[PDB]
C-alpha cells in the first residue's frame, strides 16, 4: 500500500517543495524527459543542506581573507586558492591557528556530517517508496574511500597534512605529492586493480548504452517490462553479442555486472591507499623485490630531451 501521488505532493517537513513542476524543452528533445520537480525536503535533508553550507561558507570566507578582501584578486586567483591542513610540526592536534589549519578542521567535520546524513536520506527515501536499497550501499562503498582519504590514512600516519586541501588545484597537487612521496604509484598492485575496474566500468557503460540505443526501435529500453517477457529488441541484442563474442547476458544480470564493476573500484582503491604509507613506504623497491620491474639497462633518452 503505497500512494505515489501522496509521496510526491505532500506538504510539511515530510513533504516536497517546488510543487508545480517546471518543464525544459531541450531536455525533452534530447533526453526524452523535461519535467523538473517536486523535490523532497524531509528530515535528513535539511541537516545535509545546513552542514554543507556551513563548511562552504567557512571555505569561501577564508579564501577572501587570504586574498585580502579584494574582489578582483578573488576572481583572478579563485582556481588556485585553497585551505590546507595543519603542517607536519603539529601532529593530529586541534590547537592550530585559524589561518594555519583550524578552518580546514572545522569545514571537514561539517562535510563528514553532511555526507553521512545524505546516505541516511537515500536509505529512507528508498524504503518510503516501493524500491530496494541498492543505491545506499553503493554510496557506502564510495564513502569508504572518502573516509580513508580524509580521516583514517592521516590517523594511521600521524599528521593532518597527509589529507588534501580544499581547492580546485589542491586535489591535483595532493595526487601528485602522494604518488611522489611513497615511491611510484604505478607499482602499487591495488592501484592496478582499481584502474582495471575503472576502465572496465567505462567500457561496460559505453557498451550497454550503445546496444540499448541501437535496438530501441523495438522498445528495448523499457527494462522493467523486459524482465517479465523479452521481445525483439532484447533478442536482437543477445544475438548481436553472441555472434560477436560467443556469449551474452540477460536484461537482468547485465545490471548486476554494472553494479559490481562500479563497486569494486572504490574498495580496491581504499585498500591500496591505506597500505600506501603504513606498510610499504616505497612501491618501486617493493616491486623490485617482487620481480615485476623490467631491467632497462640502456635507455634511449634522446626521446625525453628537447
Partner 1 sequence: SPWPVWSGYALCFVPLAAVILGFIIAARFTDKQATSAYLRLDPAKAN
Partner 2 sequence: MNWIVATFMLMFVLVAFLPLVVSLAYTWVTNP
Partner 3 sequence: DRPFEFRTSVVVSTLLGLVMALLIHFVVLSSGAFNWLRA
Ligand X SMILES: CCCCCC/C=C/CCCCCCCCCC(=O)O[C@H](COC(=O)CCCCCCCCCCCCCCC)COP(=O)(O)OC[C@@H](O)CO
Ligand Y SMILES: CCCCCCCCO[C@@H]1[C@@H](O)[C@H](O)[C@@H](CO)O[C@H]1O
Is 61 in contact with 44 (CB distance < 8 Å)?
no
Q: Pattern of binders to ligand Y over 181-220, x per CB under 6 A? A: ----------------------------------------
133 in contact with ligand Y (CB under 6 A): no
Q: Which residues inside 28-67 make contact with partner 3, applying CB under 8 A?
A: 43, 46-47, 50-51, 54, 57, 61, 64-65
The site partner of 30 among partner 2, ligand Y, ligand X, none (C-beta below 5 to 8 Å per kind) is partner 2
Q: Which of 49, 45, 40 is nearest to 16 (CA)?
A: 40
Cα–Cα distance measured from residue 71 to residue 60, given in angstroms and rounded to the nearest whole number: 12
The greatest distance separating any two alpha carbons of the chain, rounded to the nearest whole angstrom, comes to: 74
Around 61, how many Cα atoms within 13 Å sit in the side-chain half-sphere? 12
Q: What contacts 24+ positions apart, CB below 8 Å, involve 253-260?
A: 254/208, 255/223, 257/204, 258/201, 258/204, 258/205, 258/208, 259/134, 259/138
> Segment near ligand Y (CB under 6 A), from 2-10, 48-56, 86-94, 190-198?
86-94
Choice between 158 and 232, CB closer to ligand Y: 158
Task: State the nearest-atom distance from the C-beta of 263 to ligand Y, in Å.
Answer: 26
Cα angle 52, 53, 59 (rounded to 5 degrees) comes to: 95
Is 160 in contact with 106 (CB distance < 8 Å)?
no
Task: State the nearest-atom distance from the C-beta of 203 to partner 2, in Å.
Answer: 16
Please report, as ranges, the residues that interact with partner 1 according to CB under 8 A. 189-190, 193, 196, 218, 228-232, 235, 238, 247-250, 253, 257, 280, 286, 289-292
30 in contact with ligand BPH (CB under 6 A): no
Around 196, how many Cα atoms within 13 Å sit in the side-chain half-sphere? 10
What are the cell numbers at 247? 556469449
Say if residue 186 carries a ligand binding annotation.
Answer: yes
Say if residue 223 carries a ligand binding annotation.
Answer: yes
Choice between 84 and 182, CB closer to partner 3: 84
Q: Which of 87, 81, 56 is nearest to 66 (CA)?
A: 81
Choice between 56 and 212, CB closer to partner 3: 56
Say if residue 221 carries a ligand binding annotation.
Answer: no
Sign of CA dihedral 239, 261, 210, 225: positive
The site partner of 225 among ligand X, partner 2, ligand BPH, none (C-beta below 5 to 8 Å per kind) is none
Cα angle 41, 45, 46 (rounded to 5 degrees) comes to: 90
| Residue 167: how many other CB atoms lie within 10 Å | 19
Q: What is the DSSP secondary structure assignment for residue 83, as one 8-state letter?
A: B
Q: Which of 164, 148, 146 is nearest to 156 (CA)?
A: 148
Choice between 29 and 291, CB closer to partner 2: 29
Binding-site size for ligand BPH (CB under 6 A) equals 8
91 in contact with ligand Y (CB under 6 A): yes
Task: State the nearest-atom distance from the C-beta of 234 to ligand X, in Å.
Answer: 15
Q: Which residues are annotated as a binding site for Mn(2+)?
A: 208, 223, 255
Q: Which residues bind ligand BPH (CB under 6 A)?
A: 199, 202-203, 206-207, 210, 244-245
Q: Which residues are annotated as a binding site for Fe(3+)?
A: 208, 223, 255
Q: Which residues bind partner 3 (CB under 8 A)?
A: 12-13, 43, 46-47, 50-51, 54, 57, 61, 64-65, 68-73, 91-98, 102, 105-106, 109-110, 113
Q: Which residues are annotated as a binding site?
A: 186, 191, 208, 223, 255
Amino acid at each position: 500500500p503505497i500512494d505515489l501521488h501522496d509521496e510526491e505532493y505532500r506538504d510539511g517537513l515530510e513533504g516536497t517543495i517546488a510543487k508545480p513542476p517546471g518543464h525544459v524543452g531541450w531536455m525533452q528533445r534530447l533526453l526524452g524527459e523535461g519535467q523538473v520537480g517536486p523535490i523532497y525536503v524531509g528530515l535528513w535533508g535539511v541537516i545535509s543542506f545546513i552542514t554543507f553550507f556551513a563548511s562552504a561558507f567557512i571555505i569561501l570566507v577564508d579564501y577572501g581573507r587570504q586574498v585580502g578582501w579584494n574582489p578582483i584578486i578573488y576572481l583572478r586567483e579563485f582556481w588556485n586558492l585553497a585551505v590546507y591542513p595543519p603542517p607536519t610540526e603539529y601532529g593530529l592536534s586541534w590547537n592550530v591557528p585559524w589561518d594555519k589549519g583550524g578552518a580546514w578542521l572545522a569545514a571537514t567535520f561539517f562535510l563528514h556530517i553532511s555526507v553521512l546524513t545524505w546516505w541516511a536520506r537515500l536509505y529512507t527515501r528508498a524504503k518510503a517508496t516501493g524500491v530496494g536499497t541498492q543505491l545506499a550501499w553503493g554510496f557506502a562503498s564510495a564513502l569508504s574511500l572518502y573516509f580513508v582519504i580524509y580521516l583514517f590514512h592521516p590517523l594511521a600516519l600521524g599528521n593532518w597534512s597527509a589529507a588534501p586541501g580544499h581547492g580546485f588545484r589542491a586535489i591535483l597537487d595532493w595526487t601528485n605529492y602522494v604518488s611522489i612521496h611513497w615511491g611510484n604509484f604505478y607499482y602499487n598492485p591495488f592501484h592496478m586493480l582499481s584502474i582495471f575496474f575503472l576502465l572496465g566500468s567505462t567500457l561496460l557503460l559505453a557498451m550497454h548504452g550503445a546496444t540499448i540505443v541501437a535496438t530501441s526501435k523495438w522498445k528495448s529500453e523499457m527494462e522493467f517490462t523486459e524482465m517479465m517477457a523479452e521481445g525483439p529488441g532484447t533478442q536482437r541484442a543477445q544475438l548481436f553479442w553472441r555472434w560477436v563474442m560467443g556469449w551474452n547476458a540477460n536484461s537482468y544480470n547485465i545490471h548486476i555486472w554494472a553494479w559490481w564493476f562500479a563497486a569494486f573500484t572504490a574498495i580496491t582503491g581504499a585498500i591500496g591507499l591505506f597500505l600506501s604509507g603504513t606498510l610499504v613506504p616505497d612501491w618501486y623497491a617493493w616491486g623490485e623485490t617482487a620481480k615485476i620491474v623490467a631491467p632497462w639497462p640502456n635507455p634511449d633518452w634522446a626521446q625525453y630531451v628537447f
